Amino acid sequence: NYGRGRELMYQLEKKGKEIKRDLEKILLSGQARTDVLADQYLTNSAADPA
């Protein structure tokens, strides 16, 4: 431990949150709204037959 000493690799808390530039694209992308709840979200037809 005489060389690398940048906080003992405590990174990924800031300057490294690049996930934001992927979230931005996910929002401004033309992906569908696929789901499994039959688009109702409140089926509850005798204890969620699904």
Partner 1 sequence: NPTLFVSYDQNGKKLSFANWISVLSPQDTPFVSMTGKESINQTIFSWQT
The residue among 25, 30, 27, 48 whose CA lies nearest residue 38 is 48
End-to-end CA distance of the chain: 56
C-beta of 26 vs 47, nearer to partner 1: 47
In the block, residue with structure tokens 């109702």: 40
Give the SS3 label for residue 34.
coil
Residue 50 CB, nearest approach to partner 1 (Å): 8
Site for partner 1 in 16-45 (CB under 8 A): 42, 44
C-beta of 11 vs 45, nearer to partner 1: 45
Task: By CB under 8 A, name the one of 7, 13, 22, 48 that touches partner 1.
Answer: 48
